[PDB]
């Protein structure tokens, strides 16, 4: 008789390397179904913000307008998703956008050579000002209540050092973007996570007593932080399972083929969540689980 | 993977292996024919690099499914290879439009598709008579080989076939029949050709 209380008693978490950019927490005593559901929800369903509906006023750069628009769209912003509202998408364009459902960006860069240039110089910065166009050149000219709301939240790229385009003297670019909330599945541009995969905790089942220098070469096959040597009896043993990538290098050697079976536990998920600068991995994980809860509740409440 | 046993391109596998090794170590891998003797097998050469890098010696990287989320039965052979896009990027459809009264030829001209002789044979081979009729489709009563439809003042259109008021002198034996419109062109061409046949017009 499996039950919620039994699951709660058996389930436990082990946060390993929590960071403002990356998370490496573990899930224990949970089913691959729920683990993969979380993985997929994090990768796709978790909402985020990215630029689209870009309007061009003028462009003459070598990079084409479509390429530039796509390149700008593939930028990580900083505003939290829980500050904006979805768009009905079946409205007139003037009504399609408001203060609280989108944000506006402007680039309007112009490039011209600076006469003061050292002789025999090939560096574009010295040869011409505005030689390169960076993300930080994007401004976030607000509208209406956005000025008050974003006072402590200036909309800046999560990575202002990215290279949108290169210019030349007499070369100018001027555009106008419109970032909205994304759903990830619509386009990878709306991906709050660089990658939210997981790996099952490797399991090493030592059968024979591995001793002597033969144990030392067995130690060599795995990554250094995995196998331990028992000083008491010169015995090889597992020190840290998480430290091992599934390499199967031992299987190549015939001596150890029968001495160990490289199994894998089935209820120990080593989650590893990178992120863009929009939100922290913990925040996006909580968003994912709450999204799953909302899905279940909506499915329950909608009648048949 | 089923492509390889017939195609027999071990080069794809070796490229995948060396590409993974190069992408990991950062170095560039050279692929020049006749530099690997059998005693210097490229599989071994790149496996040594992958092992020193800490990956699978044979390139078999363990993977997990994306739908079930469970581990796959065997480690997947994954690597990096060079991939080129070709220019062979075609679809055509028509219902009516341009048209021997048969539809025009050409994708860009909103044309149709010709039902060839072998297609007609396939139509017959199945015995699908109505299907053949719909894929290949969809008269002077006395002479049986036109001329009609010239109302004068306020009367309905009648027939005045010269080959044949009421019948002036022409004839008044002609009714509508269902035929392909290539037939009229064939009739006119034979009339110029000076050849006529007893086209046995069936009765009512």
């Amino acid at each position: 008789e499996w039950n919620v209380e039994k699951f709660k008693k058996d389930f436990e978490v082990n946060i390993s390397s929590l960071d403002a950019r990356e998370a490496n927490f573990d899930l224990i005593n949970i089913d691959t179904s729920i683990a993969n559901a979380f993985r997929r929800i994090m990768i796709s369903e978790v909402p985020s913000v990215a630029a689209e509906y870009v309007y061009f006023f003028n462009n003459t750069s070598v990079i084409q307008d479509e390429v530039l628009a796509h390149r700008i769209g593939l930028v990580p912003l900083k505003v939290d998703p829980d500050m904006l509202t979805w768009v009905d998408s079946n409205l007139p364009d003037d009504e399609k956008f408001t203060d609280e459902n989108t944000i506006v960006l402007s680039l309007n860069v112009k490039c011209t050579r600076n006469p003061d240039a050292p002789k025999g110089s090939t560096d574009p910065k010295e040869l011409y000002n505005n030689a390169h166009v960076y993300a930080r050149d994007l401004k976030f000219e607000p509208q209406g209540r956005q000025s008050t709301t974003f006072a402590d939240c200036p909309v800046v790229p999560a990575d202002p050092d990215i290279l949108l385009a290169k210019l030349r003297p007499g070369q100018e670019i001027s555009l106008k973007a419109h970032c909205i909330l994304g759903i990830g599945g619509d386009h990878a541009k709306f991906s709050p996570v660089s990658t939210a995969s997981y790996r099952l905790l490797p399991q090493i089942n030592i059968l024979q007593p591995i001793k002597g220098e033969s144990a030392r070469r067995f130690q060599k096959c795995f990554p250094p932080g995995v196998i331990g040597i028992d000083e008491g009896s010169d015995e090889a043993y597992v020190k840290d399972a998480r430290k091992d990538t599934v390499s199967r290098e031992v299987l190549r050697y015939e001596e150890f083929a029968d001495k160990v079976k490289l199994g894998r536990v089935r209820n120990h998920f080593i989650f590893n969540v990178e992120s863009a600068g929009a939100m922290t991995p913990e925040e996006i994980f909580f968003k994912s689980v709450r999204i799953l809860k909302n899905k279940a509740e909506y499915l329950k409440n909608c009648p048949i | 993977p089923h492509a390889f046993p017939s195609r027999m391109t071990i080069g794809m596998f070796v490229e995948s292996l060396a590409g993974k090794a190069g992408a990991l170590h950062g170095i560039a891998q050279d692929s020049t024919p006749w530099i690997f003797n059998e005693d210097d097998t490229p599989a071994d050469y790149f496996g040594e690099q992958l092992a020193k890098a800490g990956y699978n010696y044979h390139g078999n990287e363990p993977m997990y499914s994306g739908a079930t989320g469970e581990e796959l039965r065997a480690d997947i052979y994954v690597g990096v290879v060079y991939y080129q896009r070709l220019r062979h990027m075609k679809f055509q459809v028509r219902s009516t439009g341009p048209v021997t009264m048969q539809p025009v030829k050409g994708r860009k001209r909103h044309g149709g598709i010709r039902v060839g002789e072998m297609e007609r044979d396939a139509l017959i081979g199945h015995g699908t008579s109505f299907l053949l009729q719909d894929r290949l489709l969809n008269v002077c009563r006395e002479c049986g080989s036109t001329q009609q439809s010239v109302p004068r003042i306020g009367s309905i259109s009648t027939v005045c076939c010269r080959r044949c008021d009421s019948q002036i002198v022409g004839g008044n034996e002609t009714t509508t029949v269902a035929i392909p419109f290539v037939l009229k062109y064939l009739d006119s061409e034979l009339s110029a050709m000076g050849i006529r046949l007893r086209y046995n017009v069936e009765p009512k």
Binding site: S16, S17, R199, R242, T245, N272 | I27, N37, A53, G54
Partner: peptide
């Protein structure tokens, strides 16, 4: 013939 000369990865969270 001289053979091709030789050339002189962490888990997640490590």
């Amino acid at each position: 013939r001289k053979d091709v000369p030789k050339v002189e990865h962490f888990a997640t969270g490590y």
